[PDB]
Amino acid sequence: IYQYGG
Amino acid sequence: IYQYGG
Amino acid sequence: IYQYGG
Amino acid sequence: IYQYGG
Amino acid sequence: IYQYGG
Amino acid sequence: IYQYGG
Amino acid sequence: IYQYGG
Amino acid sequence: IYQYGG
Amino acid sequence: IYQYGG
Amino acid sequence: IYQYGG
Amino acid sequence: IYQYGG
Amino acid sequence: IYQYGG
Amino acid sequence: IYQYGG
Amino acid sequence: IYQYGG
Amino acid sequence: IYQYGG
Amino acid sequence: IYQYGG
Amino acid sequence: IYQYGG
Amino acid sequence: IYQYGG
């Protein structure tokens, strides 16, 4: 699981 | 799962 | 699952 | 599953 | 499944 | 399934 | 299934 | 199935 | 799990 | 220009 | 320009 | 320019 | 420019 | 420029 | 510039 | 510039 | 500049 | 500059 926000 | 937002 | 938003 | 929005 | 919107 | 919108 | 709209 | 609209 | 915000 | 092959 | 191969 | 291969 | 391979 | 390979 | 490989 | 490999 | 490898 | 390896 890889999550990137911004 | 790969999630990218922005 | 690959998700890209922006 | 590949999803791209933007 | 490949989905592209934009 | 391949879907392209835009 | 291939769908293209736009 | 191939569908193209636009 | 990898999460990046900012 | 729209090109589809396959 | 839209190109789809495969 | 939109290119999809595969 | 949008390129997708695979 | 958006590039996705894999 | 957005590049994803893998 | 956003680069992801792996 | 954002770089992720692995 | 953000770099992540591993």
From Swiss-Prot, chains A, B, C, D, E, F, G, H, I, J, K, L, M, N, O, P, Q, R:
Where it sits in the cell: the answer is: Fimbrium
Induction is noted as: Under control of the CsgD transcription factor, part of the csgBAC/ymdA operon.
Output the superkingdom of the source species: Bacteria
Describe the function of this protein.
Curlin is the structural subunit of the curli fimbriae. Curli are coiled surface structures that assemble preferentially at growth temperatures below 37 degrees Celsius. Curli can bind to fibronectin.
Family that this chain belongs to: Belongs to the CsgA/CsgB family.
Q: What is this protein called?
A: Major curlin subunit
Name the source organism: Escherichia coli (strain K12)
Please give the range of the full-length protein represented by this chain.
Answer: 47 to 52 of 151
